[PDB]
Amino acid sequence: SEPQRLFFAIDLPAEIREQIIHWRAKHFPPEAGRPVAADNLHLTLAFLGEVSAEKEKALSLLAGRIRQPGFTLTLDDAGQWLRSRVVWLGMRQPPRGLIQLANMLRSQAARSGCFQSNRPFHPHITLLRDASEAVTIPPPGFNWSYAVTEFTLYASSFARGRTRYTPLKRWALTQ
Ligand SMILES: [Cl-]
């Protein structure tokens, strides 16, 4: 019944996660930044901040009322945001369904009193953190494309020199 640090996210198939870390190790030396663990690669829909058990339940219920078709993500884009010090993977033209889902979840969080960054939703998958220096970003690998069937509520913790994301609940997207 202690508060947890939560976020909604979309996950990647194992095969694609593996292609990504192989591609990453090939193009980015350790000095380019701190690599996100393969299992920790995800696309965040909405950050909720620290959330009480009571508030988690309310947000989970609102998430469960979402009615949306599934969509396809094709990762054709890669870049670097120096100020936020990340190297990221993303999509040039995200499907509307992704935008709809994120905005819906973000709206629900906001209306519940959740911490607001007032940052415009920029769908991305963080590959490197603490990326300070400016490196050369290659295009992604070929055919990193898959159907999104669901989204998940995660808890975030740190154990044994690792970041850990714990799945709490999942909701399927219709199709
Ligand atoms: Cl371009």
Author numbering: 2 to 176
Quote the paper:
Comparisons to the apo form of the enzyme determined in the current work allow the highlighting of conformational changes and binding determinants of the reactive species. In a ligand-free active site, also Phe48 is seen to take a conformation distinct from that seen in ligand complexes. Hence, as opposed to CNPase, in which the active site is to a large extent pre-organized for substrate binding, LigT shows more flexibility.
The 2H phosphoesterase superfamily is an ancient group of proteins and protein domains characterized by a common fold and a few conserved active site residues.
